[PDB]
Design a protein around this nucleic acid. Structure first.
Length: 979
DNA sequence: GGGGAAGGATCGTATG
DNA sequence: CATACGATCCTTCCCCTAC
């Protein structure tokens, strides 16, 4: 009584399935979407594309006769061809046939006459022979183009204009049915990409969750232990873009009540449990598998228990659409172990999953941390609360273990419900964050598969997109390589132009940030930074300068040596434009067009009410345009990172050095121009300059304030006029700066932008500033603060960090008369901290709660001391004949909530720990001083750790974490003094 | 890896 | 005036996630 994928799809959309089968009967062209891409390495190369048709059917399509090739840059001739033939034959490499052609080298500028270079293309039958031949030819010093060595489906995506994450049209195929999967065989000239907006996708995502058991109480279950078992396997199948359950199931050992919302299958053993899981997987055939933290606890434990019982081979072969495979191949090539997934520049994750062909695995946790690289709490509850979704049901783990042990068939239904809701929340997060469409659009722009957009970094994607744009081209097939060459020199680039910030509470004149709009791509656009326009020899550069060519000179100090170079300018002619400027200009034009389209779609969505039967497609188009513009942004902001990476094939030290030096030169020019115009400089950071208007421009506006009744409302009037005059003057300042830049570099791709006005403002140090933000009209009554640098977004251990950090900032940023004896930042911190300490009643009890875990095997000192004190108290109460029921020990692994209390005359954390129930029973003081000292002063020290008094002497090595110690000690002394 | 709690001697310094 | 306090350098898990 189990319903397979075909019947479910037929039940969902009958008319679409009828149209699909009518098209299939007549062998008409149809539509396909790939999700997981698998390729065979040995033997004849056939590329398998797994995915879904437009109704929801599972389709495998194999692309036969893909041309497998790579290019070598030698002079084409009979003698050279014979020599290369002998070289390939001597090291027993099987070749198919050879071709000759002409291509443009990517490194080094050449004139028009010598623009093309001869290349010989080697055709091959298998990928293994190609990899051996490419290694042999690279070891002999020959140059190699179209030289991908890791994955070859990127070659198929690049050469054929065939995105592997977008729709593909099947024409002239060969259908063959084998049940739940439909097999097509296609010739690569019979495949085309679907240009316009495709229909609604109908892929299937299976969200699964596992609940386990361990005889050793209070310890996380471990796969290696023999007694450790899985007992709940709960999984649901959803659409790619919906949260409604298509079909749900629970696979169990312990008896459970029949439920009308999901199907429960009873298994008498763990082996039968795993086989039932595999059978339901095979019957449903997910396009995508998912689950929260499934690559670190779920899949390893499943595969370890499958290996222990010796059923891994049969489970894999039932769950995979590929042919039969043996256990060694499954453990070697398909079960990945210790794979590294990158979040940011300093964070990496270890993941392990079973990549069965026909289904692509995604961790919800990996996407959640990729979208929020600075997230501090990475639990499911934390992400659910941040994203504003329904939280998990309150079921403790020890209660689950106890109810499993009692074998009570009635209430294991609650355990199943908890596991199914945990499965639901994963795809709830996936739909709410719109991860899969964003990855699809990244793949469309990058010509990669979805697997690469999920588990690989974006730098390789940018490199792939650049190669894809280069190889097609409009002016003659620019050829480029992929593997890196030359010595990977390591060093530090020259430092940025440091501008000393004028620290303090600036509330006499407004400041405003002039920002370079996409500075590094703009300099790449303007100065024609491309590898094929680079000249290294000085004599060649002089010869080009002789024949009426415009060049840009770059010179920088790297590793104590002078690196110099010349770049050929395009002179505002698209024919002479380089590869990087062409790619960036195309991406910027696309971004502008989609910005216009998104504005029109948003206006239409605001116009059209939700009751009309057209809101779904409008929201769906809005989702596509938002995803597309986000992908365009993430590729455009990554060009400099890929250009500066040493491992990149396109890496060129003059290119990165010239980009940095040109940014330096333009920032210096803007700085000098602004100073010579009379304006002031407050802060400068790479691409941003904060400008303060001259005093004289305000004079008349100030004069009416001095001759008035001199009241408060007069001062808000003064501030209002101040902001208006600042905006009006500095818009013209920005226009003149743009005109000067255009007159300097000769192009119009480098412009400045007027982001918002900051008044009053506070710069506390390097990359640490805040203030009131004004966008078009002044509003000083707002509670929204423009913040950068200060880590106010930190829940930490208490909510007092939030409250006091906000209160300091708000007390600093209000308007004050020039006759109210303006206190500096340190005095404001002093008075707000005194107000916090003295006025105890302003706080509530719930902000003083902390949570901890009681694990009687770990050497957690404070928890050990608290539990020892509680045990001593319980023994003392029992000796006195007192029923210490609410003093009882927690169950092992059970989280408990505590507070800190005053202890009259140790100072350790443990002796002040008390239970929440005990604290509310006795109404004890909550010892605000300890909380303030250990949690609030960390943030409060960030505000005054650049003052003159808190400075190191000259004879000290460490300069960063050496003044905050004195700041914290000074605040400690002040807090202890105020009593 | 980055922050949280806990443990020890001696110089730096002070006082009845 | 020689003891007693105290803070800094430095060292060791523990929490983090999933049960």
């Amino acid at each position: 009584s189990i319903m397979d994928r075909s019947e479910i799809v037929a039940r969902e959309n009958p008319v679409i399935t009828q149209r699909v089968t009518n098209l299939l009967q007549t062998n008409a062209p149809l539509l396909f979407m790939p999700i997981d891409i698998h390729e065979v390495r040995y033997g004849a190369y056939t590329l398998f594309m797994y995915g879904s048709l437009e109704n929801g059917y599972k389709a495998e399509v194999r692309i036969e006769n893909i041309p497998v090739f790579f290019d070598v840059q030698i002079e084409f001739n009979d003698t050279n061809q014979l020599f290369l033939k002998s070289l390939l034959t001597a090291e027993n490499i099987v070749y198919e046939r050879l071709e000759t052609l002409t291509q443009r080298p990517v490194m080094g500028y050449r004139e028009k006459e010598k623009e093309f270079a001869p290349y010989i293309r080697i055709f091959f039958k298998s990928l293994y022979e190609r990899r051996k031949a490419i290694t042999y030819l690279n070891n002999m010093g020959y140059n190699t183009a179209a030289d991908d060595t890791t994955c070859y489906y990127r070659m198929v995506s690049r050469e054929l204009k065939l995105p592997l994450t977008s729709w593909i049209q099947l024409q002239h195929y060969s259908y063959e049915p084998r049940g739940l999967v439909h097999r097509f065989s296609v010739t690569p000239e019979d495949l085309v990409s679907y240009q316009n907006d495709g229909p609604t996708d109908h892929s299937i995502v299976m969200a699964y969750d596992i609940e386990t058991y361990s005889p050793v109480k209070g310890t996380v279950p471990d796969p290696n232990q023999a007694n450790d078992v899985v007992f709940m396997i709960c999984m649901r199948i959803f659409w790619i873009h919906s949260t409604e359950p298509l079909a749900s199931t629970c696979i169990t050992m312990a008896p459970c009540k029949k439920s009308s919302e999901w199907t429960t299958i009873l298994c008498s053993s763990e082996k039968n449990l795993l086989l039932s899981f595999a059978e339901q997987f095979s019957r449903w055939a997910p396009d995508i598998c998912t689950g929260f933290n499934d690559s670190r606890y779920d899949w390893p434990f499943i595969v370890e228990k499958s290996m222990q019982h010796g059923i891994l081979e049969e489970i894999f072969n039932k769950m995979s659409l590929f042919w039969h495979q043996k256990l060694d191949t499954i453990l070697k090539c398909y079960y990945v172990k210790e794979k590294r997934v990158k979040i940011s520049a300093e964070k990496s994750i270890i993941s392990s999953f079973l990549h069965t062909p026909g289904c692509l695995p995604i961790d919800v946790r990996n996407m959640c941390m990729q979208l929020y690289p600075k997230a501090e709490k990475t639990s499911l509850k934390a992400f659910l609360e941040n994203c504003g979704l329904d939280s998990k049901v309150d079921l403790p783990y020890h209660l689950m273990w106890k109810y499993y042990e009692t074998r009570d068939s009635e209430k294991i239904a609650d355990v199943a419900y908890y596991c199914i809701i945990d499965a639901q929340r994963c795809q709830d997060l996936l739909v709410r964050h719109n991860v899969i469409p964003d990855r699809r659009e990244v793949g469309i722009l990058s010509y990669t598969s979805l697997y690469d957009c999920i588990y690989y970094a974006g730098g390789h994607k940018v490199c792939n997109m650049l190669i894809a744009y280069a190889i097609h081209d409009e002016y003659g097939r620019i050829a480029c390589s992929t593997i890196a060459r030359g010595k990977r020199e390591h060093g530090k680039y020259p430092g940025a132009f440091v501008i000393d910030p004028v620290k303090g509470l600036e509330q006499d004149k407004p400041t405003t940030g002039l920002d370079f709009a996409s500075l590094y791509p703009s300099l790449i656009m303007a100065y024609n930074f491309s590898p094929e326009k680079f000249v290294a020899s000085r004599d060649e550069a002089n010869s080009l300068m002789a024949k009426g060519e415009s060049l840009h000179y770059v010179s920088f100090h790297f590793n104590n040596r002078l690196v110099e170079g010349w770049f050929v300018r395009h002179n505002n002619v698209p024919d002479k434009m380089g590869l990087y400027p062409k790619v960036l200009i195309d991406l910027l034009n696309k971004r502008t067009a989609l910005k216009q389209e998104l504005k029109k779609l948003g206006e239409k969505k605001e116009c059209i009410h939700e009751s009309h039967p057209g809101f779904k497609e409008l929201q769906f188009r809005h989702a596509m345009v938002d995803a597309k513009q986000k992908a365009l942004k993430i590729f455009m902001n990554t060009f400099y990172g890929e250009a500066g990476n040493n491992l990149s094939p396109f890496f060129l030290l003059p290119l990165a050095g010239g980009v940095t030096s040109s940014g330096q030169y333009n920032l210096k020019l803007v700085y000098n121009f602004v100073i010579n115009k009379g304006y002031g400089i407050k802060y400068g950071d790479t691409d941003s300059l904060y400008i303060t208007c001259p005093d004289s421009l305000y004079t008349e506006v100030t004069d009416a304030y001095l001759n008035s009744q001199k009241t408060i409302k007069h001062y808000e009037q003064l501030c209002h006029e101040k902001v208006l005059l600042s905006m009006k003057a500095m818009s013209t300042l920005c226009a003149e700066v743009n005109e000067y830049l255009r007159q300097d570099n000769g192009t119009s791709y480098l412009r400045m932008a007027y982001e918002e006005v900051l008044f009053p403002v506070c710069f506390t140090g390097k990359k640490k500033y805040y203030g009131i933000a004004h966008v078009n009209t002044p509003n000083f009554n707002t509670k929204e603060l423009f913040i950068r640098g200060i880590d106010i977004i930190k829940q930490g251990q208490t909510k007092l960090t939030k409250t006091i950090g906000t209160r300091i900032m708000e007390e600093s940023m209000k308007l004050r008369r020039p006759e109210d004896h303006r206190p500096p930042l340190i005095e404001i911190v002093k008075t707000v901290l005194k107000d916090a300490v003295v006025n105890m009643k302003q706080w509530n009890f719930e902000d003083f709660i902390q949570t901890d875990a009681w694990r009687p095997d770990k050497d957690n000192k404070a928890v050990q001391i608290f539990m020892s004190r509680m045990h001593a108290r319980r023994e003392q109460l029992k000796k006195h004949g007192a029923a210490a029921s609410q003093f009882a020990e927690p169950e092992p692994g059970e989280r408990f909530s505590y507070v800190i209390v005053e202890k009259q005359v140790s100072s350790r954390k443990g002796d002040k720990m008390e239970y929440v129930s005990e604290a509310k029973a006795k109404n004890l003081p909550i010892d605000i001083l300890f909380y303030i000292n250990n949690y609030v002063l960390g943030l409060c020290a960030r505000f005054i750790n650049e003052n003159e008094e808190f400075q190191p002497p000259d004879n000290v090595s460490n300069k960063d974490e050496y003044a905050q110690r004195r700041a914290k000690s000074y605040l400690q002394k002040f807090v202890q003094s105020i009593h």
